[PDB]
Amino acid sequence: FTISVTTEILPVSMTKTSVDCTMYICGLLQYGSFCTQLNRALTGIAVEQDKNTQEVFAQFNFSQILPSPIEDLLFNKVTGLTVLPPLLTDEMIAQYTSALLACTITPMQMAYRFNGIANQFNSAIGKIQLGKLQDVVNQNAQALNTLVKQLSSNFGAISSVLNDILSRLDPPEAEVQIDRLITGRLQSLQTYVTQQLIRAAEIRASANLAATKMSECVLGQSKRVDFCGKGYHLMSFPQSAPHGVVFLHVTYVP
């Protein structure tokens, strides 16, 4: 006969990334279109990450939830080759989540929501005060660092600088060495692209899950149990998070 508040963490996007093949290979005039295909895959991932935010966002006191100490706590606790700025800025998504929180917050809503105790709710809110956000941020940071390290690697050539090889080796051998360097760099870029594809798929799954929650778990009632919340469902309280979404599911249990 008691209510509780459960915190759910769902990543919806990671750091934006893209490459410029005209500058990536050299700061062979044009090795091939393989790098162009890699850049196309990366910009497809970028568009997917820009769309995930629109999929999830913009789709008895409440001082802690309604502004936003929780949002600030998540902001400060959670921390070619150009990182593009996200299309939706932090304050865009903050305004969107605040507006949707205001929409879903409007003690008569408790009376109407019982069809499908202030101290218990206050205690559940207080006991709350981010692992997957750190996971994805650190993982993409390590991915970019590893890609830079592979860029610095000679990959069996005689140096890591194309201009140094041009000024140091004859053309009939400089072309072979540059071919080795560019093939190794494009192999590293292929590893980055495929890792970003699989991780983009895994973040798209979570973004679709979060969008479903933001459509039914926060709007109206989640008639389906165990989806969001430990038991029967009353309402959810979304919270903007850096490269993620935080839900505060208010559940009712016997």
């Epitope: 990959f155 069996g156 140091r168 004859d170 051998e173 192999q187």
Partner: antibody
Framework: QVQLQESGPGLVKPSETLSLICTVS????????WSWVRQPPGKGLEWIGY???????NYNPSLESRVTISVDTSKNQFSLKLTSVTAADTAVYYC???????????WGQGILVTVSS | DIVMTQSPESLALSLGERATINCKSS????????????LAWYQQKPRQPPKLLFY???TRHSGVPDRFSGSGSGTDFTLTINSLQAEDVAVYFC?????????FGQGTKVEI
């Protein structure tokens, strides 16, 4: 037809520079990279590093701070100077002509060098 | 640093039969984009300089008879001496030229 012949002292004193000069007969010396592969007795071949007539050079990482190689086009030769020769450097040396993709084409009749007395 | 291993060692094969030598690499020795194996096979005769038998682990050099056939995929590499004769007695080894340092094989001596 490219032939490589080694020359140098068969006995080198410990902690003294080991100089081995490989002379190339036939073909040309300003054509490919030149390595100085080494085989210790009863051990697999060890790649010491490949030079170049332009002055370009790439040592083995394990021996980068002690190996030095110099290619002279005027005399059509290339020489290996191994410094700080310890007791474990006793081995046979093959001067090789590594091609553009850096696989050995001609190996050359290596010379055995040992440290004693 | 790539560790290159010759699992078959001291192959005592008679005349008219086949000897197989396997070279195993610690990691891949071929670029994923090109799928071109950066491995070579050499043979060394006693009191004689070694000779280049195979480069790219598939392509054959000049003067190599049809007896020797090389292949492989990624890490495993196979050299088969079809119809081995007395001329094939030597120490065969594998070389990688993918990334420095360029470690050779331990050397497998094929005895009659």
């Amino acid at each position: 037809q490219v032939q490589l012949q080694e020359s140098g002292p068969g006995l080198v004193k410990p902690s003294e520079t080991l100089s081995l000069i490989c002379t190339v007969s036939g073909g040309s010396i300003t054509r490919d990279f030149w390595s100085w592969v080494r085989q210790p007795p009863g051990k697999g071949l060890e790649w010491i590093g490949y030079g170049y007539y332009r002055g370009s050079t790439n040592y083995n990482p394990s021996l980068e701070s002690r190996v030095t190689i110099s290619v002279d086009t005027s005399k059509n030769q290339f020489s290996l100077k191994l410094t700080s020769v310890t007791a474990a450097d006793t081995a046979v040396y093959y001067c090789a002509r590594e091609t553009a993709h850096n696989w050995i084409d001609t190996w050359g009749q290596g010379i055995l060098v040992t440290v004693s007395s | 640093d790539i560790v290159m291993t010759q699992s078959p060692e001291s192959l005592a094969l008679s005349l008219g039969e086949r000897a197989t030598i396997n070279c195993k690499s610690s990691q891949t020795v071929s670029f994923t984009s090109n799928n071109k194996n950066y491995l070579a096979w050499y043979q060394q005769k006693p009191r004689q300089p070694p000779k280049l038998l195979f480069y790219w682990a598939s392509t054959r050099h000049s003067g190599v008879p049809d007896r020797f056939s090389g292949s492989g995929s990624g890490t495993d590499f196979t050299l088969t001496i079809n119809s081995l004769q007395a001329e094939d007695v030597a120490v065969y080894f594998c070389h990688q030229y993918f990334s420095t340092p360029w470690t050779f094989g331990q050397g497998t001596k094929v005895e009659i």
